[PDB]
Design a protein around this ligand. Structure first.
Ligand SMILES: Nc1ncnc2c1ncn2[C@@H]1O[C@H](COP(=O)(O)O)[C@@H](O)[C@H]1O
Length: 240
C-alpha cells in the first residue's frame, strides 16, 4: 500500500520506440504479486498501453529501467522480446530520485526479533535518523523509541525481506509512504507505530549498481519525473 503526495505531474504526448527486453536492466528486485497482476492484465486485454521509462546506460548498449520492472519481467516470462519505451533525459535536473518510507502499525518486538534472526542489529540511538539521512547506517527505525540498524545494502535487503515476510505471514500492517513527514503525521494520528528511514539513492548510485549487475530491494527508488507519458495503442502481439 502506498501513500504519496497528490503529485500534479503532467501527461505529455511523448512517442515510444520498441526496445528489446534483453537490453533493459532492472535496478530493483521484483515483487511476484505485481508481476502476476501485470501478466493477467496484459493477456486479458491484449493491449500494452503504458510505455517503459528508460535511461541510456553511459558506455553500454543497455538501458536502465526507470519505471516498468514488472512490465519488463512479465513480458519476458510470456516469451515476448520487446516493449514500447520512452527514453528519458535521466540526468536532467527535471528528474528527481527519492525513496519510500516503509511504515508499520503493529508490535515492535516481533519485528525486532525477526530482524535479529536474519542477522541484523537494532540499537537504540537518538541520532539514528540523522545517521540514516547521511547514509551512515542501513535504516533508522523510528517510533516511540529510535533505533539504528547498521550496515549498507545487504542489511537494507534483509529489512525489506523481513517486513515483506511478516506481511506474507500476516503479523504487520505496512504502508510505503512517499514522504516520511506524512508517515510522522499519521504516526501522531495513531494509525502508524514505526517508520523505517534510509537515505535515498542518487542517480549515479542507481547506474553504478546496474553496471555492477546488482539490484536494490523493492520500494527503494521513488522517481519523480517531469511527465507521465500519455497512453499508447500497442497490441501485445507486436511484442513477440
Ligand atoms: N495491459 C497493460 N499494458 C501495460 N501496462 C500495464 C497493463 N496492465 C497493467 N499495467 C501496468 O503494469 C505495471 C506493472 O508494474 P511496473 O511495470 O513495475 O510499473 C503497473 O504500473 C500497471 O499499471
Amino acid at each position: 500500500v502506498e501513500k504519496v503526495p497528490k503529485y500534479d505531474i503532467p501527461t505529455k504526448k511523448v512517442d515510444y520506440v520498441f526496445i528489446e527486453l534483453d537490453k533493459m536492466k532492472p535496478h530493483q528486485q521484483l515483487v511476484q504479486k505485481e508481476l502476476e497482476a501485470f501478466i493477467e492484465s496484459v493477456t486479458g486485454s491484449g493491449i500494452f498501453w503504458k510505455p517503459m521509462l528508460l535511461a541510456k546506460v553511459p558506455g553500454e548498449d543497455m538501458y536502465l529501467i526507470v519505471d516498468g520492472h514488472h512490465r519488463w519481467a512479465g513480458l519476458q516470462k510470456l516469451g515476448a522480446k520487446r516493449a514500447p519505451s520512452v527514453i528519458l533525459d535521466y540526468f536532467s535536473d527535471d528528474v528527481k530520485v527519492y525513496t519510500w518510507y516503509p511504515a508499520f502499525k503493529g508490535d515492535l518486538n516481533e519485528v525486532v526479533e525477526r530482524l535479529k534472526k536474519e542477522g541484523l542489529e537494532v540499537i537504540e540511538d537518538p541520532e539514528a535518523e540523522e545517521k540514516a539521512e547521511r547514509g551512515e547506517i542501513a535504516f533508522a527505525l523510528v517510533g516511540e523509541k529510535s533505533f539504528a540498524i547498521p550496515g549498507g545494502l545487504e542489511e537494507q535487503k534483509k529489512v525489506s525481506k523481513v517486513l515483506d515476510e511478516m506481511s506474507v505471514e500476516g503479523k504487520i500492517e505496512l504502508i510505503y509512504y512517499g514522504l516520511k513527514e506524512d508517515a510522522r503525521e499519521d504516526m501522531a494520528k495513531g494509525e502508524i507505530d514505526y517508520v523505517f528511514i534510509r537515505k535515498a539513492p542518487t542517480k549515479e548510485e542507481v547506474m553504478e549498481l546496474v553496471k555492477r549487475g546488482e539490484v536494490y530491494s523493492p520500494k527503494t527508488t521513488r522517481h519523480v519525473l517531469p511527465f507521465n507519458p500519455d497512453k499508447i495503442d500497442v497490441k501485445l502481439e507486436e511484442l513477440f
